[PDB]
Design a binder for this molecule. Structure first.
Ligand code: SF4
Ligand code: SF4
Ligand code: SF4
Ligand code: FCO
Ligand SMILES: [Ca+2]
Ligand SMILES: [Ca+2]
Ligand SMILES: [Ca+2]
Ligand SMILES: [Cl-]
Ligand code: NI
Ligand SMILES: [S]
Lengths: 489, 279
């Protein structure tokens, strides 16, 4: 009595995604995640001036280009042997941090929320699933249903302007957005002025107000209606984080620290243990067993028997691990926002001080949205601080020369999860460039040993009581905020 | 107040053209969506998914045959029978599954459109996906149309990404033309099919640093005063109105901040590289 459901395109994610599930007795019993578009940035990059990479790589994704730019310039800093100044480090954090706010807001509202909020009766808000299990369906008190839906929809609409303001903030020291000009090997290209810091701060305060007063309350309210969605979309419960937003010049300390949590245990992150498998991916590897990214190979093969995705399969110590706000917030275990502490008590009867106090609820559809909203607040607190630390007039750029032969790796966290760029230089040109990038860790296919990727695994057990309206499949997938451009590059 | 019907499709794109559109002002995106266009299909933001989303796309392409704009973001890969870009899966009168390639989708929808508008350098000219080293046979809309012998009105709005003013302005001008062609002639296009409205000015000729250039005052590094030519600026060979319009609601632009990388040009990126070596 199994039924197959195939969803292609899985919309309201970035890029080209197919999801296939098998449903039996009202639950998903198997799943496959497929990325269907390939460009091959790692091939395109070969033979170029290594400095070009921080422009080229941004075109992997127009939603998170600052993350790729950050990883690239850090790889170049490493390979070129140059140390960034204090003000360069802070300026890079302000450019990138403004897009963290943009990205999370864009995701929750403009990608995720139409699985919960009933939009106006015009395209692109319709057509939609006939039985969509929305706020207007769930809340049985009709006036409360209308009021809550309108509350959510008005925030969706306002968030269009808030996310645009976040890009004004990115452009302030980044030049423009999408695709900044302001980050390069050696630091940042424009020294912040007192006036421009103040202009960034004024916009930031408006974004921060929306985060605290509108976004956080909506997420906690939404979860209080969809309590069942804290109880499904579980998955491996393995997470990894690389560290993001260095808080000192030697990159020893971060806003959100590196770490790994596997099978209920915390461990340190060791980059030597990252490798990629391609048994079910459209790629050929010269040797069996998975490849560390420092010897990564990008030889596309859409005819590979048994393969079903252009996404490779990264594993850590041969374990599937997921990434993103859930991962970072679990690893760091920061104190929850005052709003979160209050609304968890008021709306759920939950006493919680730190992120891990959510327990099992963290590893779920709603847990992922909560992690993302809380991280948006946490990032805003950091930006508010960096705005006081940044020094008008202080040098942000240090000169460098392209080395003949070198290697470098840039480690960061994209808004969607752990990101590194590995750069190998020979004869002053890119010899190899290997990208291991956020959604790659989430939306990957099975490895050579048949272990499902995190989204695939998290789909197992998701309720599908109505096969014609399988709304929880998309809800699970979108809780991960996938970027398939990033996943495949 | 009849809105322009739009079907927005993505090939080998990064969604940056879409994100740049979301940054529009005067009008802002809310007014664009509710008052200016009917965005019928767009994979990043639309409510429906899978079978329902594709069925709706095709229903619009039929009901509004010869009366919708096909907006294309990203390049069209032609190697390996189009299999480097699968845009969806369709289902027959029987129950079987068929993948749809970007090639198949464009071949299908372009003849149904009123006009095709290639937004971004990828769709207009090939861009980064079509750059040296790619193995996907990545192609622009104009080249794909030529290979396919498709004659459909085509307007290119390049940039990586294009400014929202360029996309909105071009689309509004096209729609105005359709509604009253003699009162609103189509914008004059250059040899590369992009409107002179936005791509007629040379960046360098219009640059506020031109006086410094003329006096041989060149910035020694990014954070020193002077013209940016020695840092790699491609303003001299690039045609766009960025010096006037600036970016992100007038907040900054590439040349003030750093360098122009020639992102609107048909030879971007290879003809504009290395980015940090002077022209
Ligand atoms: S033109 Fe540039 S911004 Fe637009 S899809 Fe292509 S790479 Fe992305
Ligand atoms: S080279 Fe660049 S910075 Fe200098 S005047 Fe020309 S466009 Fe302006
Ligand atoms: S200034 Fe140059 S790189 Fe920047 S948007 Fe304009 S054409 Fe593109
Ligand atoms: N955030 C983001 Fe994009 C993804 N996944 C990257 O890296
Ligand atoms: Ca195939
Ligand atoms: Ca890779
Ligand atoms: Ca033909
Ligand atoms: Cl703008
Ligand atoms: Ni992205
Ligand atoms: S980003």
């Amino acid at each position: 009595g199994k039924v197959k459901i195939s969803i292609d395109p899985l919309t309201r994610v970035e890029g080209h995604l197919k999801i296939e599930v098998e449903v039996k007795d009202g639950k998903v019993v198997d799943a496959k995640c497929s990325g269907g578009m390939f460009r091959g940035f790692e091939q395109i990059l070969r033979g170029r001036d290594p400095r070009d990479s921080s422009q080229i790589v941004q075109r992997i994704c127009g939603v998170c280009p600052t993350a790729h730019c950050t990883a690239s310039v850090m790889a170049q800093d490493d390979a070129f042997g140059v140390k960034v100044t204090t003000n360069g480090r802070i300026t890079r954090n302000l450019i990138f941090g403004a897009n963290y706010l943009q990205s999370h807001i864009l995701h929750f509202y403009h990608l995720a929320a139409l699985d919960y909020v009933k939009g106006p009766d015009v395209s692109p808000f319709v057509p939609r699933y006939a039985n969509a299990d929305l706020l207007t369906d769930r809340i049985k008190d009709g006036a409360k249903a209308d009021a809550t839906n309108t509350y959510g929809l008005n925030q969706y609409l306002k968030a269009l302007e808030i996310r645009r303001i976040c890009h004004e903030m990115v452009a302030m020291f980044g030049g423009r957005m999408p695709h900044v000009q302001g980050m390069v090997v050696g630091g940042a290209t424009e020294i912040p002025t007192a006036d421009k810091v103040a202009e960034y701060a004024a916009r930031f305060k408006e974004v921060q107000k929306f985060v605290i007063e509108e976004y956080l309350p909506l997420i906690y309210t939404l979860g209080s209606v969809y309590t069942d969605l804290f109880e499904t979309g579980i998955g491996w419960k393995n997470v990894i984080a690389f560290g993001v937003f260095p808080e000192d010049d030697d990159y020893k300390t971060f806003l959100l620290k590196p770490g790994v949590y596997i099978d209920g245990k915390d461990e340190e992150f060791d980059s030597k243990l990252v490798k990629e498998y391609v048994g079910h991916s459209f790629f050929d590897h010269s040797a069996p067993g998975g490849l560390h990214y420092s010897v990564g190979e990008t030889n596309p093969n859409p005819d590979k028997p048994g393969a079903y995705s252009f996404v490779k399969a990264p594993r850590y110590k041969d374990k599937p691990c997921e990434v993103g706000p859930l991962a970072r917030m679990w690893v760091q275990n920061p104190e929850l926002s005052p709003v979160g502490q209050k609304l968890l008590k008021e709306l759920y009867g939950i006493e919680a001080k730190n992120f891990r106090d959510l327990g099992d609820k963290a590893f779920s559809i709603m847990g992922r949205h909560v992690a993302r909203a809380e991280e948006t607040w946490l990032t805003a607190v950091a930006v508010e601080k960096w705005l006081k630390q940044v020094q008008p007039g202080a040098e942000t750029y240090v000169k460098s020369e392209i080395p003949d032969a070198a290697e470098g790796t840039g480690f960061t966290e994209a808004p969607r999860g752990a990101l590194l760029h590995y750069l190998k230089i020979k004869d002053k040109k890119i010899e190899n460039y290997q990208i291991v990038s956020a959604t790659l860790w989430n939306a990957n296919p099975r490895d050579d040993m048949g272990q499902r990727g995190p989204i695939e695994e998290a789909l197992i057990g998701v309720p599908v009581p109505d096969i014609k309206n399988p709304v929880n499949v998309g809800r699970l997938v979108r809780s991960y905020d996938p970027x398939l451009g990033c996943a495949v590059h | 107040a009849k809105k322009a019907p739009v079907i927005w499709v993505q090939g080998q794109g990064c969604t940056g053209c879409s994100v740049s559109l979301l940054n529009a002002v005067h009008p802002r995106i809310k007014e664009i969506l509710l008052d200016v266009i009917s965005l019928e299909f767009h994979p990043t933001v639309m409510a429906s998914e899978g079978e329902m989303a594709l069925a709706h796309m095709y229903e619009i392409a039929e009901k509004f045959n010869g009366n919708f704009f096909l907006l294309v973001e990203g390049a069209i890969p032609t190697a390996k029978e189009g299999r480097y870009c699968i845009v969806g899966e369709t289902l027959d009168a029987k129950g079987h599954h068929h993948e749809v390639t970007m090639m198949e989708l464009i071949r299908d929808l372009a003849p149904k459109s009123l006009a095709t508008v290639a937004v971004g350098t990828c769709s207009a000219y090939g861009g980064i996906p079509a750059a040296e080293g790619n193995v996907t046979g990545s192609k622009s809309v104009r080249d794909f149309f030529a290979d396919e012998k498709i004659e459909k009105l085509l307007v290119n709005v390049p940039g990586c990404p294009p400014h929202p003013d360029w996309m909105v302005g071009t689309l509004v001008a096209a729609w105005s033309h359709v509604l009253n062609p003699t009162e609103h002639p189509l914008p004059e296009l250059d040899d590369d099919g992009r409107p002179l409205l936005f791509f007629g000015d040379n960046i360098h000729e219009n640059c506020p640093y031109l006086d410094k250039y003329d006096n041989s005052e060149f910035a020694e590094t990014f954070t020193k005063p002077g013209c940016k030519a020695e840092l790699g600026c491609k303003g001299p060979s690039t045609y766009a109105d960025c010096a006037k319009r600036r970016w992100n609601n007038g907040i900054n632009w590439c040349v003030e901040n750093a360098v122009c990388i020639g992102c609107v040009e048909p030879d971007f990126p290879d003809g504009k590289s290395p980015f940090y070596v002077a022209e």
